[PDB]
Amino acid sequence: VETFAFQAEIAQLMSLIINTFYSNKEIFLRELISNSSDALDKIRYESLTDPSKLDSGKELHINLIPNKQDRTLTIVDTGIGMTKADLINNLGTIAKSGTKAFMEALQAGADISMIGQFGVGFYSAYLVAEKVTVITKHNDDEQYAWESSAGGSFTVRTDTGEPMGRGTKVILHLKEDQTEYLEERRIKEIVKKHSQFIGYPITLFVE
Numbered sequence: 409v410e411t412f413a414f415q416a417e418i419a420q421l422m423s424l425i426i427n428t429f430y431s432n433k434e435i436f437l438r439e440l441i442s443n444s445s446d447a448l449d450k451i452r453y454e455s456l457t458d459p460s461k462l463d464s465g466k467e468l469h470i471n472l473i474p475n476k477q478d479r480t481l482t483i484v485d486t487g488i489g490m491t492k493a494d495l496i497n498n499l500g501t502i503a504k505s506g507t508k509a510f511m512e513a514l515q516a517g518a519d520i521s522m523i524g525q526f527g528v529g530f531y532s533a534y535l536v537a538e539k540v541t542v543i544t545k546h547n548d549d550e551q552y553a554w555e556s557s558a559g560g561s562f563t564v565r566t567d568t569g570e571p572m573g574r575g576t577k578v579i580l581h582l583k584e585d586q587t588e589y590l591e592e593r594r595i596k597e598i599v600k601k602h603s604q605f606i607g608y609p610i611t612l613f614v615e
């Protein structure tokens with residue numbers, strides 16, 4: 409288990425997301441589904457020139473899995489997945505620019521719902537989650553668990569849980585007052601409103 413500090417701008421973004429009063433929290437789901445769809449586009453594209461990239465699983469899809477016992481909502485995709493270097497360095501590097509632009513736009517009169525336009529939509533998870541665990545597997549790399557409760561740090565470890573083939577699972581440990589996102593009716597409402605034209609099947613598991 410290695411512990412890392414977020415780069416300063418991402419820590420700042422996460423605190424803004426956690427601290428700002430903003431009632432329209434439901435947009436976290438559209439952002440994470442859009443991230444999954446982007447990951448799925450990438451593996452689909454890559455497989456056109458290299459068919460063996462789909463040996464780790466041919467099906468391209470998204471599952472949404474609520475668990476009231478654990479108070480988690482899990483978004484699973486079989487997209488391209490993330491490497492160790494993604495988790496520790498690259499994602500944070502790419503996001504440094506988008507954070508700055510987003511934070512400047514918010515001063516200009518934009519709102520938190522537009523986070524996705526700046527390539528940092530993942531961090532909207534913290535509108536609803538006290539902790540986020542990300543399990544991910546890229547071809548030719550090992551499976552990793554990334555985890556953060558914000559507070560300026562995150563951890564990465566080699567994951568020895570259930571092997572997943574290829575892709576990413578984002579596990580949102582929901583805040584005590586956000587359990588509405590475990591309800592079938594609520595998730596269905598949100599997917600229909602914001603994520604109706606995603607080009608991959610989205611399966612909403614029932615409890």
Ligand SMILES: Nc1nc2c3ccccc3nc(Cc3ccc4c(c3)OCO4)n2n1
Nearest residue numbers: 443444447485488489490499530542554576
């Ligand atoms: N599902 C998924 N798949 C990816 C993905 C796949 C390949 C390359 C980059 C990627 N970035 C993100 C969005 C993201 C951003 C920061 C993160 C994160 C996911 O997980 C931990 O920190 N995601 N999210």
